[PDB]
């Protein structure tokens, strides 16, 4: 999901 | 329990707030398309902006996605309403997009209403990213996240005891701003309603993220 | 105004003289079984406590003095949040289950058919209401607070008559706590835990109310549609 | 209205 693709990178 | 918000002073804490503040993004050259386009820039900057909000770190992944999965929408009329303030009657959306009630029109005039009732407080920055901070970690449903809720309420106290507010102005306006919250997340449900039957009418494309954190409400 | 006037003392007895009662439901022990007849349970208790709200919102202090229309737009955007509040109330001596009436506890086994959601978030509130040991002096203030509060941000200085009465109220909050014995700090932090906790009774009511104009077959009753159709349209 | 008749009385 793209939530946690910008909350870890 | 490792954290970074429990460490600090009241003031480190605004200070740390402050810092983290996202930027003011402006809209691209129908209109709900545009707003959908910001909106969804806007998300990308919330995601960062919430990574450097003190407590917001040390808190597990999954507790992280869910808060922003039920905060974003009240974190972005927040800003709205912020960002209206000095202009009474329309809501500033972006620089270059200055709009009346008149161009979901029931949820634009229950921004306006926020507006003017936080410009009419004299609402400060300070106050304002200290709200910010609570509606995210209030979004979800002593708790580590309660601890942190219990230290931005400090803060907010604290702020207002340096404005020279009395013991009794305080409790009030902090009741003042708490009970706004209470609207916010009306508007932000009334706001998800439209925005997923908006999504069946087909009529304006949601983007992924919007599209993402949509589905999330359940 | 007159309820200007009024003490914190006498603001407390004012609001747990106008108490509505804990009212009961329709006994009969095979309608709480299925879908559509336990909603039923629900839709007609929820009727007849209305009646009680709308007189006991007529003696909350400054309501009275409040217009006509304004006192109508108050209670309905706030009537589902009021009896949600006294639901959570109810259900503070009873961990994991929902006392909608003394003759009708929930399970959340029951909310799993047909809604499990917003029963879990209703069991989280009533939760946290136990655990902070909620006093009905304190109970009375939010409940206050709720009916004046929600529908406010919808000559006009009616907003401001409004606000200076909840003004009242968080003094009145703020003095319970410190004749309950709280220091300075827990006071403020006891009251912003109280109002956060609005939000979410906010965030319930606004669930429960969708799905109520979707279960739109479960009769309901003429005062249940007058108030949901102002939350549609 | 019925909650206006309701405030009526
Ligand atoms: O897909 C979306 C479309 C609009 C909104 C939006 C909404 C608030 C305003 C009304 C506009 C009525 O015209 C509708 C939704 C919004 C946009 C940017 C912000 O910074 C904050 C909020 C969010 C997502
Ligand atoms: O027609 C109605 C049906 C149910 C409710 C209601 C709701 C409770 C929670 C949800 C749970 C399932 O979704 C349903 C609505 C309620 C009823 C009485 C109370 O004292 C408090 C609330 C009000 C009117």
């Not at chain 2, 009346?100 to 926020?114: G, H, K, P, S, W």
């Not at chain 2, 009419?120 to 002593?142: A, H, R, T």
């Not at chain 2, 219990?150 to 306006?173: E, F, N, S, V, W």
């Amino acid at each position: 999901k793209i939530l946690h693709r910008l909350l870890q990178d | 329990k490792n954290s970074l918000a429990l460490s600090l002073t009241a003031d480190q804490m605004v200070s740390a707030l402050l810092d983290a503040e996202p930027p003011i993004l402006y809209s691209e050259y129908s209109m709900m398309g545009l707003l959908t386009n910001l909106a969804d820039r806007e998300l990308v900057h919330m995601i960062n902006w919430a990574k450097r909000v003190p407590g917001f770190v040390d808190l597990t992944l999954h507790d992280q996605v869910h808060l922003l999965e039920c905060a974003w929408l009240e974190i972005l009329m927040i800003g709205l309403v912020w960002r209206s303030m000095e202009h009474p009657g329309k809501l500033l959306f972006a620089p270059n997009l200055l709009l009346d009630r008149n161009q979901m029109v029931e949820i634009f005039d229950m921004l306006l209403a926020t507006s003017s009732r936080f410009r009419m407080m004299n609402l400060q920055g300070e106050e304002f990213v200290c709200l910010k901070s609570i509606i995210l970690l209030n979004s979800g449903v002593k708790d580590h996240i309660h601890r942190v809720l219990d230290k931005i309420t400090d803060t907010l106290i604290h702020l207002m005891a340096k404005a020279g507010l009395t013991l009794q102005q305080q409790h009030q306006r902090l009741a003042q701003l708490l009970l706004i919250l209470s609207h916010i997340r009306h508007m932000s449900n009334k706001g998800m309603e439209h925005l997923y039957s908006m999504k069946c009418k087909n009529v304006v494309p949601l983007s992924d993220l919007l599209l993402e954190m949509l589905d999330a409400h359940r």
